[PDB]
């Protein structure tokens, strides 16, 4: 889950393989909205602390 | 429903929403060579998922006045991928193609192209006691393209190109025994021929003779009103089908 | 564009010729500033490891 | 649990598994065999760790208190709830709806505070930890008549032993515990907003039953949550702020994720 | 009254409750039935992939 | 395990099997019988000593550290391996690949440090050990966050009690660890040269969870690992060396054996 | 009879007059990948007998002061034929080796060469606070060879080479529990090792691991009197045995 | 759930596993079997002792 070398990952990327066509009186600019989820062979092991929260004092 | 297709080989799929079939070739599928067929004695290389998918070749803008453009087969590939690395090393191998042009443009323009896969598309020169260069009939995945006005005789190796002859002689709108479909804009976006390996011989070298030609024409120019998109490009994407390799040697 | 709705949104736009890139980001969720705090990458910050595909669809 | 993949050959067909409509607030099922071609593999991998029986039950340090043997703050309040603490009220938060049994477990120790006692001389220290269910008598002191014990739960720890432990079932008037309350308690929306008593569980309360030594002694009393038995409905987003206080879900303003040069950039900042 | 259950491998564990409550067990660890169904496709119509989303 | 002699009587035959070719990569199958006249003896001797899962399944200390409830060195930090101490190393890498589980066993020892501070009187000692797996936050102070443990696996151990002990699973990604790599983790073939993410396997924190006294007292915690459950592949000559550095297989070079005063001499020095 | 062999891989055949048997690994012989043990999901490409045939390379001299040679396996040939360029195009691939090992020498000379396969010889470094880099350790075809004094120690990226350590920091004389022959000139000219494929993972990155290194260690030197051939050489011949590769994407 | 087998000797023990993971189980003492041919003998032609081992 962390970074290391030894399991990189690999790059995503995405290229135009046409332009974007458009008539006159419609917007020559869109936009694109991603989404990512697991697949049903996936699975997760090795349970640890989040560094995602913190606390200086109790609430 | 018909008009959606997928297409995969390999790592590569192909999607598209608008599509008018696909052809096959003569009614004849790719496949590998029989043993009844076969002359070469050695054991066949045959790489699979590692030729056989889909290659983008560079795109070309269509204009106006544009003629149209041709692309020789095993030589536009013959820098890509372990395609590229499966003929420089072999002195033999067999293949089909899937040839797939795509062009998109809004409901507000039109235009139409001719997509053709020609059998051994031997082309003239500009002057006529001497033959074309080879730098002047391969790209190596860029797009050469036709003229509207005949060449120039000099002391020329230079291809005879016009459109309406097709640089070969004939009449252009007769292109249509070859394994075709049209690009029309106001229907589909796409096209799809299915090539099967057509040769006189078995296998053949691949660095010395191109058994097929990709042309795409113009037939009713490409025109928009002010205020439309005023660069419509033109990619091509082609896939090995059922290569094979013979002849194992050194790279060159 | 964290502070705004912009950052979900990826730009395409009309422009001269093709084969121009619009995106690019590394596979390696629960470490990537992209993916860390995706509803996927958040139950994979909790654990070590990780394995199996994932699935990005574009809208 | 993990499924396995299934070869696939060559396809050119009028099926469009990649090709979906996202707009229908549908996840598509579409597996890797679909968009190119795989091999067949035997997967042996399983999800037995991301059992919410396996995520949420581990211990979890919810509080600490300090009480001495002499002068002020003679023994110790705290009103249970798992909000104190950040990292286990994150991970039931991914919850609405929650149901379990509580097993406490207490780590008590004692410190030696500066004096200048001559001559000091500790006997072991026992100390009495008594859970009061809502309502009935507090103690208002040290040797007040609630430390009997008639009919309230209580533990005895001498020190040097193993940590104490109970196990408390699931208390709640309602059918399950609430993370999250959208209302108010009084029927005119007036007063506190968020509150509830549906999550009421008692008061715990903590002292020494002997000061041992002439010298000054101070404890502190650690308690760790474990969920057990759990079940939970309706999952949520995670919380994506810092937390500010314990009855309240307010929040100061948080960007969405950590910057980077580009959006072509393979490196984060 | 003893349970005899199978271990996490890669043989089995005896186990006997010694009190009067329910609430007094150890931990249900081994419990892996899930259903994600619920969460992905929860619309009416049966989506099959293989066929447009919209027709 | 031990075979049974065979006896044999004279022999005058074309048979050769003291006769044999070295060069072919092949240990010779002789046995004494072959060579001269023998009686039959029957071995009750095992090999039971010289198993795999007899040699390494023996707790060996790797390493030990050193903490106060004072001052500067609150904590002790310590990354998992079995490569800081000689003896168990050795062992290990008679073998390239391995596969165990561990059990760690915890001694804690705490000795009085001079001062002038008058009238001492500890408190018993609690420590707090708390594993942390790969990723995730790092005390970088005692009294900090990450030592709530809500979900990082930890103990707790009062004085005078018996040892902590806790297994460990085998944590690796690959299908065996490794104790020799030939390669770089970078595609550069750049950068430090031998190092694996195989054999992570976390760190390991350590502290009181109390002062008990007045006065500074330092603790000391060995680690002691023990293999079990073992199986290794891929037999390799000793080490002939001493070792270096931890991350390393660097040496200075040594003598095959050492001297003697002729090749006829019976006695070594 | 019992020295008479012959090997076929692809187009390549070796005979050798004089043959010690061919010893096979730890009892195991190269096989493809199972389904029950594989990780990776693509199909993979395996291109048969353009990868998996004998490769000569370079020949160093043997002389009277010889202290031995080593080649680190993947890395050995990896600008070698269509083997090189698959291995850089994909991202994983294994592979287990047939190693033959010729040197031929008068029945007036004496000498004996150990020849081990050693999974994953890790090496030392000179100072011992650095490690090797990557040109100390990796030739390309052309063989590293050990000293027979120690390395001097200063502020170097140099590998520990001494014969009688192996640059490993071992005993030289155990490295009979790799899988090895013995070169002995009066008996026999060459020695064949078939490796299996030995890893902790089922398929790894060629281009910065080598989980194979071939050692050529005199143990005996060569001895000759007046008038005999003064130049005796060792060529080394390697072939890759079920060769696959996986995670096809850009060359580097 | 009890297992019994023999003791080392030159009698018999009683084992129950009392935790649901497997690697929480006492260490594997009594695993003897071998094959030192895969390390001896490596050859592809058997060697057969009592004929040459070069013809
Ligand atoms: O160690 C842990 O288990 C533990 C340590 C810190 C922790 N959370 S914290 O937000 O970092 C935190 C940090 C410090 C204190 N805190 C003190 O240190 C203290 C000293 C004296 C009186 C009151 C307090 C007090 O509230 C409270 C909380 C939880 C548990
Ligand atoms: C079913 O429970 C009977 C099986 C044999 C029981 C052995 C009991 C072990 C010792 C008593 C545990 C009692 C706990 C209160
Ligand atoms: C099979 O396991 C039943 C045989 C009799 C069991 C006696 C059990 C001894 C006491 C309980 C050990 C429980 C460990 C969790």
Known sequence: ????????????????????????????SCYIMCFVSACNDFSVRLLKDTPFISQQNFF | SDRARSITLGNSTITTQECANVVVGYGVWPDYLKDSEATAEDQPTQPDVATCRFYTLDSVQWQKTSPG????????????????????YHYLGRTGYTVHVQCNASKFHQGCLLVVCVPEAEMGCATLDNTPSSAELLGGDTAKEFADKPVASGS??????????????????????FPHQWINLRTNNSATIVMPYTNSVPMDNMFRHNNVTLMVIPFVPLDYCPGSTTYVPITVTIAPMCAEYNGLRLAG | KVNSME???????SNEGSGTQVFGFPLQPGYSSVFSRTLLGEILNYYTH??????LTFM | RVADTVGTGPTNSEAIPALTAAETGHTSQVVPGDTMQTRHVKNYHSRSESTIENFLCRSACVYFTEYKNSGAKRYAEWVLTPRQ????????????????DLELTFVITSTQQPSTTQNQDAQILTHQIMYVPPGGPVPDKVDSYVWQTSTNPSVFWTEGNAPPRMSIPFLSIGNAYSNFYDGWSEFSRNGVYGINTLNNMGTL??????????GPIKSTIRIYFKPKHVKAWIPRPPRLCQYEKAKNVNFQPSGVTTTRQSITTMTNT | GAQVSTQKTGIHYTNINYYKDAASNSANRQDFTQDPGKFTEPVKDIMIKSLPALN
Request: hydrophobic share 45%; net charge positive.
């Open chain 3, 7 to 13: 950052a979900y949104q990826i730009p395409v736009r």
């Open chain 4, 85 to 100: 603490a950040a990292q286990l009220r994150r991970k039931l938060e991914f919850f609405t709806y929650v149901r379990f």
């Open chain 3, 50 to 55: 990780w394995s199996g595909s994932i699935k």
């Open chain 2, 156 to 177: 020329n190796k230079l291809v005879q190109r016009v459109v309406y002859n097709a640089g070969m002689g004939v009449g252009v709108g007769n292109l249509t025994i």
């Open chain 2, 69 to 88: 453009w041709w692309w020789k087969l095993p030589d536009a590939l013959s820098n890509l991928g372990l395609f590229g690395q499966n003929m420089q």
């Open chain 4, 205 to 214: 309360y903590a002292r020494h039953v002997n000061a041992g030594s002439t």
């Open chain 1, 1 to 28: 889950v962390a970074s290391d070398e030894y399991t990189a990952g690999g790059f995503i990327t995405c290229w135009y393989q046409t332009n974007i066509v458009v008539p006159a009186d419609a917007q020559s």
